[PDB]
C-alpha cells in the first residue's frame with residue numbers, strides 16, 4: 001500500500017526564509033523587551049501547514065508571575081486571568097484584558113516593522129514579508145504554577161511514554177493564548193504547544209526509537225500524511241465553507257489519541273506504514289461520525305462538539321476522506 | 334543462591350530525613366543572607382548499610398567562569414573569572430578562586446548559625462543522625478573538553494537523552510590534586526542520579542510487571558558487598574581507598590555494555606549480579622576503571638590505588654563469590 005504514501009513524503013521533504021524570519025523576529029523581540037509590560041517576552045520554542053512552506057508560525061511567551069485563574073462558566077478550557085504588576089495598564093477592573101494587551105502588542109510591532117513588511121488586519125499578528133513569506137505571531141502568557149484542575153485526567157501517556165515522563169512534563173509551565181468563547185472577549189484558552197512538540201519528537205516507548213535501523217517507526221510520517229490530507233481537502237473546497245472550521249490541531253489531537261491506543265513501537269514499524277496510516281485515517285473518521293474528539297490535555301473539552309462544528313461539516317469531511325481512502329488518495333497527487 | 338541476594342535486598346529495604354530537611358532548610362535560609370553565598374541552594378542521599386548517615390550537596394552558581402585545567406589531569410581545574418560585581422571577591426587568591434578561603438567561610442557561617450557538633454571536603458553535622466554537607470560551584474556553561482567522549486549512553490538511553498543531559502549544568506567541588514591546594518574537581522552527581530532513576534531503554538522500565546529489571550538491585554548489592562568487605566577488613570588498610578563511587582562507575586560501564594532491558598530481567602538477578610561482580614573484578618585486575626564522564630581519568634591507576642590493594646580486594650571478592658557470599662549472612 002505505502003508506495004504512493006512514500007512518494008508523497010519524499011516530495012514533502014523536498015519542499016523544505018527561516019533566516020529572513022529570524023531576523024525580523026529577533027528585531028521585534030529586541031524592541032518589545034524595551035517596553036515595561038513586555039520586558040519578559042521571549043521565544044517560546046519557526047514552525048509550520050505542511051503544504052505551505054512559506055507560512056511560518058512563532059509564539060512569543062511572557063511570564064506572568066503569581067496569577068489567579070478563574071474558569072469561565074464550566075468551560076474547562078477558557079479562563080479569566082486575575083492576579084508592581086507590569087501589566088497594570090492592561091487591567092480592566094480585576095481581570096487582565098486580552099484586547100488591550102493585544103492592541104499594545106500589535107502597536108509596538110506595527111511601529112517596529114515600519115522602520116525596515118505589512119501587518120494584516122485582525123494568531124494575534126500576521127506579517128507579510130515581500131509578498132512571499134508570512135509569519136503568524138501568537139502572544140501567550142506563561143505560568144510556572146501547577147496545571148489547572150481540568151488537565152488532571154488528560155495527557156494519558158502513562159502506558160506509552162510512561163508515568164515518570166508524564167510527571168516531568170506536568171512540572172513544566174503552561175501557557176495561555178487569547179481566544180473569545182461562546183462571545184466573551186476577555187478569555188484565554190490553555191496552550192501546551194511545547195508539550196505537543198516534546199511528545200511528537202520524543203515519541204517512542206523506546207528511548208532509541210527512530211535512532212537506528214531496527215527501531216524505525218512511522219508515527220511522524222502518519223501525522224504528516226494526515227495533516228497533508230486535511231490541507232489538500234481544505235484547499236480543494238476553499239470556495240465552500242464546509243471545511244473551514246477544521247485545522248491541523250484536530251488531526252494532531254486524533255493522532256495523539258491513536259498513540260495512546262497503540263503504545264508499543266512494534267505497532268508503528270515503518271514497513272507497515274500503509275496500514276498504520278489507514279488506521280489513523282479510520283480513527284479520525286470515527287471521531288467525525290460520533291462527534292467526539294476530546295482535547296488531549298482537557299478530556300472534558302470536545303473539539304468535535306456540535307456547538308463548535310456542525311454535523312453537516314463533519315459528514316462532508318467524512319464523505320471526502322472516505323472517497324480518497326477508497327481511491328488511493330488522488331488528492332495527494 | 335539467588336534467593337540469598339533477594340534476602341539481602343529485603344533486609345536492606347526494612348530501613349530522619351524529616352529532621353535533615355528541617356535543619357538543612359534552616360542552614361540555607363541563613364546562608365542566603367550572606368553576600369557570598371546568596372545563590373546557594375540544594376542540588377537534588379546515602380553508605381547503603383548506614384541509613385542514618387546522609388550526604389547533602391549545596392550548590393552555588395558562578396555565572397561566567399573560566400576553567401584552567403591543572404596539568405593535563407582532566408578532572409582537576411583552577412576556577413578563574415571572566416571580565417566588585419563578583420560576589421566571591423572575598424575569596425580570590427590573586428586570579429584563581431581559593432577553595433580554602435571559601436570553605437573556611439562556609440564552615441564559619443555554618444558554625445555561626447548552629448549556635449549539634451560540626452566535625453571538621455565536607456562539613457559534618459549531627460542531629461545521633463549525621464549529615465555531610467559538600468559545597469559545589471554550579472556552571473551552566475557547556476561541559477569541559479575532557480568529557481567529550483564520556484557518558485557513552487547512546488545505545489542505552491539514546492543520543493537524544495545524552496544531548497539533553499549535556500545541556501544541564503555541571504558542578505565543581507573542592508579537592509586537592511594529590512599536592513596543590515586550590516584545585517576543583519568535576520562533579521556530575523545530578524546526572525548519575527538521573528540515569529540511575531531513569532535507567533532502562535524502555536521509558537516504562539520498572540513501571541509494570543512485564544518490564545521489571547534488576548539494574549538498581551545489582552548496584553545496591555555491589556555497594557553492600559564493598560561496604561561489608563571494608564568493614565570486615567577495617568583493621569587492614571588495603572580497602573581504605575575503595576568507595577561506592579568505584580562500584581557505581583563500574584556499574585554504569587556494565588549498563589553501557591548491556592543496553593537492552595531484556596539483559597536485566599529480574600528473574601536473572603543471580604547472573605546479572607554475577608556479571609556485575611565479574612566486570613568489577615576485571616577492572617581491578619587490569620587496573621583500569623575510566624571515569625564514566627571523563628574517559629581519560631583512570632580511577633584505578635597505580636598513582637591512586639596500589640596494585641596490592643586491588644589484588645587483596647580481588648581475592649576477597651573471589652572468595653565471597655565462590656562461597657555463596659558469606660559476607661551477606
Ligand SMILES: Nc1ccc(-c2cc(Cl)c(Cl)c3[nH]c4c(c23)CN(C(=O)CO)CC4)cn1
Nearest residue numbers: 077123189190191192249295297298303308
Ligand atoms: N473552540 C476551541 C477549539 C479549540 C480550543 C483549544 C483548547 C485547548 Cl485547551 C487547547 Cl490546549 C488548544 N490548543 C489549540 C486550540 C485549543 C485551538 N487552536 C487554535 O485556536 C489556533 O488558533 C489550535 C491550538 C479552544 N477553543
Ligand SMILES: Nc1ccc(-c2cc(Cl)c(Cl)c3[nH]c4c(c23)CN(C(=O)CO)CC4)cn1
Nearest residue numbers: 408454518519520521578624626627630637
Ligand atoms: N582521586 C580521585 C578519585 C575520584 C575523583 C572523581 C573524579 C570525577 Cl571527574 C568525578 Cl565526577 C568524581 N565524583 C566523585 C569522585 C570523582 C570521587 N568522590 C569523592 O571524592 C567523594 O568525596 C566520589 C564522587 C577524583 N579524584
Ligand SMILES: [Zn+2]
Nearest residue numbers: 204209210217
Ligand atoms: Zn519512532
Ligand SMILES: [Zn+2]
Nearest residue numbers: 533538539546
Ligand atoms: Zn528497570
